[PDB]
Amino acid sequence: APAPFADFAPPVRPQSTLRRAITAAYRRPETECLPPLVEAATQSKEIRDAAASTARKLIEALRGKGSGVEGLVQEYSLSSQEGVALMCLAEALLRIPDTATRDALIRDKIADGNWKSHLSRSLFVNAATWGLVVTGKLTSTVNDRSLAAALTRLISRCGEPVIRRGVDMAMRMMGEQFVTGETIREALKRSKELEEKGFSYSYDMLGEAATTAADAERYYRDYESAIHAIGKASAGRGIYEGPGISIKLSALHPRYSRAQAARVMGELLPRVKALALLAKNYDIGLNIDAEEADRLELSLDLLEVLCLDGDLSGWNGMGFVVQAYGKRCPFVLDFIIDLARRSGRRIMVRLVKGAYWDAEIKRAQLDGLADFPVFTRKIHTDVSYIACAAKLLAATDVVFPQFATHNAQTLAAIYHMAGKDFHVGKYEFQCLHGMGEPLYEEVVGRGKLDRPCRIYAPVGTHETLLAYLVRRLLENGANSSFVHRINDPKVSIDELIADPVEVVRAMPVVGAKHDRIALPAELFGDARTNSAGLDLSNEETLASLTEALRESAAMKWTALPQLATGPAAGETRTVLNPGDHRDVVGSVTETSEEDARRAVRLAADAAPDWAAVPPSERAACLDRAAELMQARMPTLLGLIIREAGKSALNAIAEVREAIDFLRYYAEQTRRTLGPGHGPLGPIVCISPWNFPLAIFTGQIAAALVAGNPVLAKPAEETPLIAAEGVRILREAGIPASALQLLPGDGRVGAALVAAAETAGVMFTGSTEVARLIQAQLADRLSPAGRPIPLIAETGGQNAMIVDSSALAEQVVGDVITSAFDSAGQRCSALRVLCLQEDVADRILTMLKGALHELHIGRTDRLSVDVGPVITSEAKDNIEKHIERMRGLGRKVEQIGLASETGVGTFVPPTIIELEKLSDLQREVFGPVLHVIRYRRDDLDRLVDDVNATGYGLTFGLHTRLDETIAHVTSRIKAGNLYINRNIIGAVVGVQPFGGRGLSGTGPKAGGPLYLGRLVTTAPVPPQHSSVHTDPVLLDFAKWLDGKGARAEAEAARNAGSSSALGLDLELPGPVGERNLYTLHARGRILLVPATESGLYHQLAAALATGNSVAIDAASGLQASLKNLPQTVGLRVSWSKDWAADGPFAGALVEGDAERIRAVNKAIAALPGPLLLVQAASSGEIARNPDAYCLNWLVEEVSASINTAAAGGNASLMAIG
């Protein structure tokens, strides 16, 4: 067998001193980056005065010489929404290729009546883009009902003339302004005018982010054909006077990433070389555009090989972008200048500020990394730019600097920095087509500054230009953007010519982080410290992780029955790597049923001593354990990789989740628990193999910090990481008597659950095992005669709905991740993709293409995307399903598996096309995506279909349309909703995780109601209240008063006020996301009363929390509820046969102890969901107004909305 981690992530090449200085700066603190940039960018007082004068002169020219859209809005008195709607209509009309056909539709159909009847795809799919054009503001989703009303209004008001003006306007903008031309030939024809004036061109073919091999091939042949046209047109003018091309490496390969570095060097590089050879033959420039920060250093390896490749010698046209908003920029320049010296190639270096800023902020926060790879104050980027220009200007003999900027202050600084000696070929400026020409017409030419400018010229169809136009608009359209500020009359020219170098120098703290951007560690402020991740694009990190992972694999991992009295003897067997059964990970000694029973008794004995540790100190143990897990993360990664079969990426996220659970439950403890919140007693924690550290730790930590001693029964498959979690918790101060580890199979779990002193059970696993546990617990009562609490999380049949407004590339990436990450072994994994019929074939084609780019194998290589499934039995169960579907004639797409997978248990990622959602009749816990199609008019029926399964865990929706968001999210019944992003990796305290129905009992893990289920008297969670009063509750209280039941009416009004139904919160989290948490009704609650007053109290509790009820007809209490108001009657039914009248969402039971036990067994016998049952005696109802706790009669819903999905972050446009 191959040695573990011997090939984890070797770099493309040994890292030179220059390359290592780049990596060293990746996330350097901002206060450390700025001082050397300030020094490098310093210029004399005389030069600064001259530069300020030149900048003022340029800005006065810019301001001395009204957009088309603004004139259109003015002429027709359009509101903003009308302007946006008009541009959307224009865009749609321009999708009609024949001019005479389009004009006939406008005259005969659009102008005179309903446009809706004439134009499967919303008119307003791209309204966020047109919103930026019309208003300058980015709104991430589209209010399509507002736009529809506006379009009707403006057409009914102004008719064909306004439609014609909109069409002509959109036609000009999309054919001449956002692009230089639709085709390279058209673009070239339109370039002669400014070339004759002294401009040059570099054509941007607008391709990026290939998703499939076919995409990458299409972008390749597009580049090749453009180079021929550009080279023919250049006609020997050379690389400075003549035109060139720009390419994006992400366009040329579907897996352009550090994780796939070997594929990039083997497959992407020869494609770039072939394009460069063609550029060399025509002697034109070929520029490599710069993209996301985690692609910078990878691109250097391609640049290095290309510049050293003798087949390309004699040609100085190779170019390369460096982004001055990046902390590595000067060190990258040092590397490039040296590469130019070694190779003798005069590398064309385009210095830009950078196009991906808000995405870099979000990504670093999501990944919990040490700092950002970009600056956070715009002025820091400006100083960086000028500092890097100084470095480039000192090396014009070996590189060709190209200063791409629309900022007249930046321009003037560099123009004077470069001095008096100039010749074409020394350096140039650059600008964007349709944006920079007003400024650079004051620069180019002997009558101006006599410096050349190359126009970066987009080329593409309407579809191509619209795909990432938002990101392009934000380059010059944010509050701190020069172009935005020059168009703001409230900004003086003096403000615009302010010298960023001197402003930064005089700051109290030079280089301070922006005050309004949280470091990833500080996302939650004073509440708790965010867990920290690891940057798998950082060579230093990969190198250190490689050694730590190797060392982890040499360790003799063990797991033992750890009782309160010490380790216990038992049957010992090895633990095998699921990706390679030859790889022995460790040894587990499993627990006898006798010792499991003994462990519960020991935990009961020790319960008072643990409950007496004050809550703040119990929370301090959790915080200490979180620190230990953070420090141990590399070793924990190795164990999770080898024992549980996970990728490094998923193992990092899992250790983060464990750390977050510990810190979250610690903080929630400090916010809530007091002397009156007594523990339940011994809690049995049964954890799954798919999150063998995170959910293991989460359940145990919550029970411990709530004051309960814990019996920890890890999954049979994954005992070693459990034993390590216990070692850490004990090292952090949890006493051995408070946390006992019982490895073994389900007999151990069953022995623990059945033990008389077990006071509560926390289970995450299959529905069938949860149901067996429920039946066990229904035999028992607490010493107080009350049901044993069960928290059971049990998976789902998770769907994602995609309509024709979603961006296919985004969908496919989110589907590939949601369905096949962790081999589909997440409970949150995407199981059914639902595609609107009109886009289903294109998305399916792209999805299948992306599927075949996945690398399946043993997960001790960074390049592996999908690892093994956990066991041979899991494998066999999944495969049986796939073959059953195949045998029914369903189309099945599968990746081929390499021969090396035979030593482990692997299922290839699979796509199965179904006719209807009901064709899927069992949860298939593997990498198996089912795809159905739906007509848009049947959307509401589809949501019914999703709900009808009875599950309700995770759910995804991809749409830009507010009406569709409102409709779907109001009708779906699931606990974790995700809008325009993947549906996996719920984040503790941000997406509290847990569902309803067949998916679980709740309360949500990583949410504020969790600890309260683990004590006998629940506290009031932080922020847990609602000002809204259920109106049916109010009608019931009035009915009670009319009947003379004045005590119960008062109790009803109190329940109405105490209810947190209607709670609606936004939780702190990363930028570019809105994370919402809301309390809803659970559904229909089964009421099993014994007395009239008990029934009234039960009804008050259920109604106050928004529920309907089914009242047990065998109570004989029908006469107690005569003449109900119709509003209340609508919510009330009587049930003789509880099994026929379900599913229920919870239950309230009244009776003595044996009545409660009998009803509990009867409820456990109901098919379907495990009900969260609350029981009370008649006397308890009389004595305790909280006898039925309202916490457990509401349903928690988490919704995470990717607000950056339109292409950028509106909120961050204000942050500079």
Ligand SMILES: Cc1cc2nc3c(=O)[nH]c(=O)nc-3n(C[C@H](O)[C@H](O)[C@H](O)COP(=O)(O)OP(=O)(O)OC[C@H]3O[C@@H](n4cnc5c(N)ncnc54)[C@H](O)[C@@H]3O)c2cc1C
């Ligand atoms: C010819 C040309 C080629 C280009 N090629 C590329 C490319 O290959 N790769 C690429 O990434 N982009 C590219 N760009 C875009 C460029 O990087 C800028 O995003 C854009 O041109 C605006 O910058 P500026 O100097 O024109 O104007 P400015 O208004 O001076 O600068 C705006 C820039 O400031 C930065 N910024 C804004 N807010 C903050 C903040 N809070 N903290 C730190 N920095 C901030 C951003 O980078 C933003 O774009 C190119 C631009 C041009 C004109």
Ligand SMILES: O=C(O)[C@H]1CCCN1
């Ligand atoms: O599992 C164990 O026994 C200890 C020793 C090796 C690493 N953890």
Ligand SMILES: O=C(O)[C@H]1CCCN1
């Ligand atoms: O996979 C997820 O979404 C999170 C929630 C459950 C455990 N990890």
